[PDB]
Design an enzyme around this catalytic site. Sequence first.
Site: not given
Lengths: 427, 427
Positions: B51, B74, B79, B128, B153, B178, B183, B187-188, B192, B298, B348, B356, B360
């Site tokens: 993204h 992306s 996104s 990702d 990701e 992930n 992460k 992140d998740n 969210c 996703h 996010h 995250s 990476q």
Amino acid sequence: QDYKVAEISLADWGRKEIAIAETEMPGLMALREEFSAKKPLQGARIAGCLHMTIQTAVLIETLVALGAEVRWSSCNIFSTQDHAASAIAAKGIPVFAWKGETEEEYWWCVEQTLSGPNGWTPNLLLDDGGDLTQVVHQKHPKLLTAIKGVSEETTTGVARLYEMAKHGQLKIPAINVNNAVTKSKFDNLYGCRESLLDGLKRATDVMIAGKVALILGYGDVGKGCAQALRGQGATVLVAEADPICALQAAMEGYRVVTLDDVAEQVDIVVTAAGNYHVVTHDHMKRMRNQAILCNIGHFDSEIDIQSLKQYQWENIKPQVDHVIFPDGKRIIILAEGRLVNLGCATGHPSFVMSASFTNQVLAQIELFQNSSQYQNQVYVLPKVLDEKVARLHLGRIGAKLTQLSNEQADYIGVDKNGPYKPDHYRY
Amino acid sequence: QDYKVAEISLADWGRKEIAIAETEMPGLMALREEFSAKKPLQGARIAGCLHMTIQTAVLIETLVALGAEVRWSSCNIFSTQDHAASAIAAKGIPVFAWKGETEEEYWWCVEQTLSGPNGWTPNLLLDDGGDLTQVVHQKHPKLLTAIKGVSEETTTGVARLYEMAKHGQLKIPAINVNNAVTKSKFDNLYGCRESLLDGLKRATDVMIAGKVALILGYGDVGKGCAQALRGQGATVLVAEADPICALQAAMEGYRVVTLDDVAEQVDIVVTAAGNYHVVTHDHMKRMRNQAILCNIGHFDSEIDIQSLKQYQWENIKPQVDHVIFPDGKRIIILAEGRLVNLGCATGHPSFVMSASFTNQVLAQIELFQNSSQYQNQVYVLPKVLDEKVARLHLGRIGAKLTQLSNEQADYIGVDKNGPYKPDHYRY
Ligand SMILES: NC(=O)c1ccc[n+]([C@@H]2O[C@H](COP(=O)([O-])OP(=O)(O)OC[C@H]3O[C@@H](n4cnc5c(N)ncnc54)[C@H](O)[C@@H]3O)[C@@H](O)[C@H]2O)c1
Ligand SMILES: NC(=O)c1ccc[n+]([C@@H]2O[C@H](COP(=O)([O-])OP(=O)(O)OC[C@H]3O[C@@H](n4cnc5c(N)ncnc54)[C@H](O)[C@@H]3O)[C@@H](O)[C@H]2O)c1
Ligand SMILES: Nc1ncnc2c1ncn2[C@@H]1O[C@H](CO)[C@@H](O)[C@H]1O
Ligand SMILES: Nc1ncnc2c1ncn2[C@@H]1O[C@H](CO)[C@@H](O)[C@H]1O
């Protein structure tokens, strides 16, 4: 009289509450329905060292219903519910447990589980905290040969098992019950979310709203403790040595602080670290008048209670003491620094204990039948059994599972009946 | 003109927001400070499919600051933040990305990252969702030989990697980013928790309070989605196929239900399952007038959007559509069923994306330097790097770690500097 309890006449009261608890413990009752006829534990002789509560009574009677003979002791000097112990004793089951044991009585109780009339000796251990495992390994090495394995309930106990295995001192297979998902992420977390507040309230009747409460440790126990006090309007502070756990706490809105910095600011201190002297004399000297200190981790040395012997102690009521500093300042110590939820209240409620104890029964079945295929290392039960424990508790609280179609199971790479997650999944 | 973006003149606006985001992304800025002089990525040629947001711009410039050459696209047609893409393009970095790509433009953009002027080809993939990994494996097998590995990701992408490895189709090492703790559990979940609400509000301006909202899936994403809507006064329902995740949701106070049962009752539906057709035509036919449906997982097939082609679609505004049933009843579809937080808002926020993306960068460094010691399987970074990511983010949000003393480190069996937890720890 192959038992030792405080007051046998409490049996009928214990029986009435056990009857209620059965309806709150569908995992244990489901194992009885599934296995009571086949008796998979026939021939099992279980020495148990685990808080002698109403919930543990349901565990004991589930083991017995599955064919086991047991001898039981509590794993904490304050955690026994005397009426639960009396109900178990009245069934003819050997139990050696009462609330308020001395240190000497405690180890005498453990020892009584290791030999019974007619040459009875255990071939299985069920442990919560590692004390029974230690006694057998260190003081009864001849008994070790006949022991098929141990299943271990709590985080500190499994840590002791890993220390033993690291140095070649573990001489039997061990099942880590704590790290079933349906234990660590339920008992440790949601159990403490209710029973920490229970212990605090029964002991002190303190208002939580508006207080500054410090939780030392943000693992599974500390996570639940924080939620508990936050829900009742406390400003919740968190201390952590682990940066990942610290970041979790910070992202939930808790200020992450050191007790070195905030000692003068706290009204309530809860140690949840499983570690040694996280609350020191200087911390306690700096605390305000009538600050409340308790420990919900497994051992009495999270707070340095020894450093308080130099002061006058004035008892308020059982398991609630004042420590009086030279300038007149007082602090309130709960349960002499031992497990506050079990020492000042009744521990976790039955429903979540059913999840923990359904894992215990499955581990005992697995050790009794298949211990020969295990080495002297620490194992966990497979995920399919973890998921079964969860399934057995959904009906009671009205949760309805979605059934995957064939294409949906295929799409995420699982069997329709599970397991649904890879072993590395953290939930 | 080795780039393709919507409007290059948005560069200066993109640059201003990237400057702000740098102050929200201390993990990435810390890696620049630690590594920009030594240039550990000198010689790295990274094709990226992720993204194209302001946050990804900071990731790209961190890779470049560490010596890498990159070409970017992306991984979702909605996104991209056009001003972020324009700021990257204005630096001379090849980026092929704009908001509102067609399907054909999308794959053309991915393809552009695989070859550059002067015979430029990637030796690394940053992915990702697995689309770039798939394209290389399936359509560019000659390029595979030179690729040292891929870092991936998101949950659906790592699932695709495990399917490949299970059938011998994975031909390069893969790092599962992930399932770094810093992460998946940040992140998740916390990402969210903020960006689902953002996407919903920007798209529809709907009141959350008093609504019945159904979250399909209670993994890391669904857990954060539930918290989000619950905090704003929705009655939150949860659907789950996994009994452990279902029990977690039930213990947080959510009713666990099936969409088969509750379709007539919901105001807002959020798919968070990573699965196929969890919302069917019949579900949508049964929903009330103006029910809002979106997908935060996703891919675009969590909702059966195909089953809606038989009806008239009336656009409200970009990425917000009405589907009109024959009886006049309307439902609101967000982003044509694709990632609602990135399609209808900005994904996010920077701070959690820094966690995250610090993972990476570390994975790319580890693949670039040590890919020869890896097999064609999927790995995770070790816990010491996971903890380092956490440490690098504590200062920004004011979290202060407690330092273990020697006896405390010994007492729980850890090094004072970590790692603090065994690899099986679930946090
Ligand atoms: N009372 C109960 O009913 C009950 C239930 C479950 C577990 N326990 C006990 O509670 C303890 C904690 O269990 P857990 O599962 O939460 O363990 P855990 O390992 O998940 O969490 C402990 C946390 O303490 C932190 N910590 C350690 N030393 C610290 C220090 N000096 N300062 C700050 N933080 C520190 C660690 O970083 C870790 O995150 C154990 O002793 C366990 O046996 C009690
Ligand atoms: N939008 C974002 O910013 C973002 C961020 C992270 C992940 N994701 C994506 O979101 C999806 C979910 O990620 P996650 O980490 O939460 O995955 P997860 O595996 O942790 O959670 C998914 C859950 O869905 C449940 N589920 C599967 N099929 C179901 C069905 N038919 N009905 C009900 N429940 C069902 C599973 O039991 C599981 O608990 C993935 O596609 C991932 O790539 C998106
Ligand atoms: N009511 C209870 N009955 C029995 N064990 C309990 C109870 N509450 C908490 N415990 C257990 O105490 C252990 C710590 O000694 C925890 O792992 C938990 O399983
Ligand atoms: N603002 C954002 N910028 C870049 N990636 C993001 C953003 N928000 C979410 N994502 C990513 O989208 C992935 C799903 O495609 C998630 O794993 C997450 O890392």
